[PDB]
Amino acid sequence: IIKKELGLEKDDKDAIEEKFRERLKELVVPKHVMDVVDEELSKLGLLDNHSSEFNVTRNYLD
Amino acid sequence: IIKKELGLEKDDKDAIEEKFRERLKELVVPKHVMDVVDEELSKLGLLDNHSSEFNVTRNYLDWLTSIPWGKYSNENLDLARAQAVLEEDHYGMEDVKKRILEFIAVSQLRGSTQGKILCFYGPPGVGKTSIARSIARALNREYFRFSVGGMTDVAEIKGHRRTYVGAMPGKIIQCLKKTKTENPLILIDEVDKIGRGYQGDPSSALLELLDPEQNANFLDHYLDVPVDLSKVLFICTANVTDTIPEPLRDRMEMINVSGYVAQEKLAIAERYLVPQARALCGLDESKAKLSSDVLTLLIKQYCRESGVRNLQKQVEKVLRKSAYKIVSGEAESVEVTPENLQDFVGKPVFTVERMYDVTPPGVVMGLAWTAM
Amino acid sequence: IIKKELGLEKDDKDAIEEKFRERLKELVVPKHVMDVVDEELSKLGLLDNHSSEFNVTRNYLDWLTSIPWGKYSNENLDLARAQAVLEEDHYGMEDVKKRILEFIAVSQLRGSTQGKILCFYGPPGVGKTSIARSIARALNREYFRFSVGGMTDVAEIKGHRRTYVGAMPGKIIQCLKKTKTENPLILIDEVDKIGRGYQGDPSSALLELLDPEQNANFLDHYLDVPVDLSKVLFICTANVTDTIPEPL
Amino acid sequence: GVGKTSIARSIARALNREYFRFSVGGMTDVAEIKGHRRTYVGAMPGKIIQCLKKTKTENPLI
Ligand SMILES: Nc1ncnc2c1ncn2[C@@H]1O[C@H](COP(=O)(O)OP(=O)(O)O)[C@@H](O)[C@H]1O
Ligand SMILES: Nc1ncnc2c1ncn2[C@@H]1O[C@H](COP(=O)(O)OP(=O)(O)O)[C@@H](O)[C@H]1O
Ligand SMILES: Nc1ncnc2c1ncn2[C@@H]1O[C@H](COP(=O)(O)OP(=O)(O)O)[C@@H](O)[C@H]1O
């Protein structure tokens, strides 16, 4: 119950998701890069949080 | 009520938050790094201990907090004391001493302390690194050297991306962490030896590092946040001023520390080399003793170059053999003379001051300004 | 509960903390690596045993603790004894023996021991490796050899980042683990045979290793902690001197 | 821009089997058809399963 609205409800990756979404929210972002970022975030959520490819994907996303 | 449920000492986490906060409390912290730290700590709290991203975040945040932010060493500004220290540590090099005294004077008149680039170009075995250390200790700013010779990986200056696990920041951030101040005495060695080969071109990074207006916002790839390098006192050393890049050559004041004639080298050896190597060999003045004539013979027959390092090798060899002759040898003390010298170092090498002294027809002597 | 009262209680079941504590208790460990080890122990306690990351953490901690820290192997100092030993296991080679006696004398006069770098260059099959072994035997410091010839990658000297699957430390780390000493006698063989090609240039690592002042804080990719190397005595063997790098 | 997709659509309509299209251009990760073991959080099946589910048949025009 505590995890609700606190704790690890983001799972160490949705934090990255929301952080980048708010970072790009103010920006007038083109649609192409928008869908590219969506696909990259989907892949990141499709990968673990302890692999080299996950870290490289995070690097590219940053 | 949701919050107040099974506190259990908060699982021992969030103590790192307070530790970093107190670590930063003493520093004068810019707004950019402060907000980055706040957001990073929020993310760290949101995360768990096991996650790899959490470990990378902790490493990056420890690097960031270990930086000296607004922390400046208590720089020495007295001119007489600095002059006495420099004269007591090295001989000659009057131009460098005058330049450093003038820098001290302008910094004192200028209020806050500043740092500017100035390259010491001259032959090897002349005392450029040693005078850099002397300046660091006399002026009270910390010291750190950096070998750029034959370097091609710009990551040594600009670090890594901080993403690849095990990535390390630029060596300058390492120096800032170790020295603990933003006004060190950084020294770059073998500037002229850069190869800037494939995937390199570190000369661009050096330009960004030394440019007095760009360097103030220098950032490495690992720690993307910028840092202020308007007070760092860089030093560059190169035996030749031609191979050094023009954009980097014209960005600093080139000071010449060149050559040591027989009398000058003899004075240096008598007052600075012999005691240093003697202390290195765990000896005392009484036990091991050399005559000025012996030093002159070493200079004029066992060492032929503007530098001094070969004379250092010879004096170290004689002192080592004296130490052997003292520990186990019959002689409790040594009085080195040319007559004895033959056994301490061997027969002379340079028996001729020149190729010849007649200059037959069709051949003439000339002077060359070689790299060494 | 009975097992806790009588059994394995505090033995290899989360007691690896205490095992490594006692293992390092003998060593005169630094303080930076002390806080590092405390942090790693906290992680291991907070890490579940089954997880692969827990096992990798234990592997890294074993690698770190296995290194000596302040372990100065006792050094022979009787000059006559070492002289007799050298004259017993090798003929001639007067210059090398004289240099070794000079080193012994300066170490004795300094009190504490110290380690410098010196290269034996000459034709193959002359006794350079054998007299290095004899010097290790007489001086009593442990002996290890390293063939750097025909070698390009620096990984075998500075290991890996520890993140690559099965990343391993440098060969010097293996030597330190095997010797159980902080001042062993490393022997670099075929120094003049380095290739220093693409992605290589191990001469940079060699210079960082043999630097009289930077050596005191050498560290590799796998282990990111400095190690003191001002007392280790290196020996370099090369059939010729021209092809060896000038900075080295 | 030659209508090959339109040719496939017309073939499906004339054959009465459901239509679907798959993009294999530049793909490197076979997981888009092989999905993932479902043991990892967020794992998703391949695209052929999506085609079968959406088409509501085992005899579509892939
Ligand atoms: N004027 C001098 N006074 C004292 N020592 C000197 C002088 N010139 C040279 N040396 C000695 O020569 C050595 C040169 O050090 P090094 O790192 O080679 O600097 P550089 O490359 O400028 O010669 C120093 O250890 C220093 O003791
Ligand atoms: N002066 C000597 N005294 C005793 N043995 C020698 C001497 N010179 C050479 N040898 C022998 O020759 C062999 C040469 O092998 P090694 O010394 O490893 O070659 P290198 O000297 O090229 O490293 C050794 O096993 C050694 O026993
Ligand atoms: N032979 C054709 N007759 C009529 N329309 C055609 C023909 N070829 C292509 N088209 C037009 O092309 C469009 C679809 O093109 P598309 O399938 O995207 O090209 P491609 O197959 O190269 O990807 C349709 O709207 C269709 O009207």
Numbering used by the authors:
A (entry chain E): 402 to 463
B (entry chain C): 402 to 773
C (entry chain D): 402 to 649
D (entry chain F): 526 to 587
Report text from the authors:
Other hLon mutants were produced by exchanging Tyr186 and Tyr394 for glutamates (Y186E; Y394E), thereby mimicking the negative charge introduced by phosphorylation (hereafter “phosphorylation-mimicking” hLon variants), or for phenylalanines (Y186F; Y394F), which acted as non-phosphorylatable controls (these mutations were introduced to verify that the effects of phosphorylation were not due to the loss of functionality occasioned by the removal of the Tyr hydroxyl group). When Tyr186 and Tyr394 were exchanged for glutamates (Y186E; Y394E), the digestion of β-casein was visibly slower, particularly for Y394E, where almost one third of the protein substrate still remained after 15 min. The phospho-mimicking Y394E variant showed a slight decrease in TFAM digestion when compared to the wild-type or the Y394F control. Cryo-EM maps were obtained for Y186E, Y186F, pCMF186, Y394E, and Y394F with resolutions ranging from 2.9 to 8.5 Å (based on the 0.143 cut-off of the Fourier shell correlation curve). Y394E forms the same lock-washer structure as these other structures and has roughly the same twist (50–55°) and rise (8.0 Å as measured by us for all structures) as the previously reported structures together with a gap around 23° wide between two of the subunits. ADP could be clearly resolved in the Y394E, Y186E, and Y394F structures. In the second conformation, Tyr394 lines the triangular gate joining the NTD to the ATPase-protease “head” domain. A Y394E substitution would not obstruct this channel but might change the dynamics of the Lon-substrate interaction, thereby slowing passage.
One of them, ATP-dependent protease Lon, is a member of the AAA+ family (ATPase associated with various cellular activities) and is responsible for selective degradation of unfolded, oxidatively damaged, and short-lived regulatory proteins, which prevents their toxic aggregation. Functional hLon is structurally organized into homo-oligomers consisting of six identical subunits. Following its mitochondrial localization, Lon’s NTD specifically recognizes and binds protein substrates, which are then unfolded and translocated into the enzyme’s proteolytic chamber formed of the ATPase and protease domains, where they are degraded into small peptides. In this study, we investigated the effects that phosphorylating two Lon tyrosine residues, Tyr186 (found in leukemia cells) and Tyr394 - the only two found in its NTD - might have on the structure and function of hLon and the effect of polyphosphate on hLon’s stability and activities.
